[PDB]
Amino acid sequence: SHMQQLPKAIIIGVRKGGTRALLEMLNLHPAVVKASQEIHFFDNDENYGKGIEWYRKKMPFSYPQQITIEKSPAYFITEEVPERIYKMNSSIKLLIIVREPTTRAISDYTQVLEGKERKNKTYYKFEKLAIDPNTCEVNTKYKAVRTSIYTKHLERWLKYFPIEQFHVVDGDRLITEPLPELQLVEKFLNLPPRISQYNLYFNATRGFYCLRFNEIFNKCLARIHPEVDPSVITKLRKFFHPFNQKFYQITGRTLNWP
């Protein structure tokens, strides 16, 4: 009745799209149980070698009628993950949360920047990295940019899973008006509606929504972005545009990105 079960839904990406926030909010649902921290199972040969059972026992204990959800942003880009997850459970449900490509790229860059300053190291401005100095065009070799070409990655995943097993969460809307996005996830997971407006409240100070559990229990989630040359922002937007249209067409969800 109380056992460690393999996840039936995995948030495979995208980093900086709001994966942590999505996981925390879904955890508001009485039938959802979240795996603590990222386990890095499918994207790490050392751990993947220990077998599915080691993975299973890293999951929290839950009841038969509950669904365990793991969050692992790196899975989206790591080339070998799809086949491994497919082997383990070909009917697994996959969640992808995304936001405006350019914005996500800058957020990605910002985290990498903070990581280097912490260790007291040097780094270049976003522009120097996202734009080829010579041609003055978008640098497609830069991961922050490549990770934002959502369609390219989804294509790999579609080689193993039907589009029906994926659900795309609008991360921009998750920030401004959460409930509707969470309600779609509830239906995607075959869960009855239980998350309510009472569970979410806007914190003008933090600038985001925070979670409200009990009567005296509120919880907010654990960055200052750099100003980018309006000109660079414009080139990136135009660059992503056609990939964005492909994304909407494949997923069925139009996200209205600039």
Ligand X SMILES: Nc1ncnc2c1ncn2[C@@H]1O[C@H](COP(=O)(O)O)[C@@H](OP(=O)(O)O)[C@H]1O
**What's the closest the beta carbon of residue 177 comes to ligand X, in angstroms?**
11
Strand order in the sheet with 93-98: 32-34, 67-71, 9-13, 93-98, 166-170
59 binds ligand X (CB under 6 A): no
Minimum CB–partner distance for residue 64 and ligand X (Å): 30
Contact 166, 98 (CB under 8 A): no
Q: Which of 26, 33, 39, 174 binds ligand X (CB under 6 A)?
A: 174
Q: Is 153 in the site for ligand X (CB under 6 A)?
A: no
Measured CA distances, 57 to 4, 73, 96, 204, 206 (Å) = 6, 21, 25, 40, 36
Q: Per rule CB under 6 A, is residue 15 in the interface with ligand X?
A: yes
Is residue 107 a contact point for ligand X (CB under 6 A)? yes
Nearest to 247 by CA among 144, 182, 125, 157: 157
Q: Is 223 in the site for ligand X (CB under 6 A)?
A: yes
Contact (Cβ atoms closer than 8 angstroms) between residue 117 and residue 33: no
Report the residue from 20, 143, 173, 212 that binds ligand X according to the rule CB under 6 A. 20
The stretch near ligand X (CB under 6 A) out of 1-9, 15-23, 139-147, 183-191 is: 15-23
CA distance 148 to 162: 22
150 labelled binding-site residue: no
> What is the DSSP code (8-state) at residue 131?
B
Q: At closest approach, how far in Å is the CB of 148 from ligand X?
A: 13
Under 8 Å between Cβ of 12 and 72:
yes
**Size of residue set near ligand X by CB under 6 A:** 15
Residue 101 in contact with ligand X, rule: CB under 6 A: no
The footprint of ligand X (CB under 6 A) covers: 15-21, 73, 107, 174-175, 208-209, 221, 223
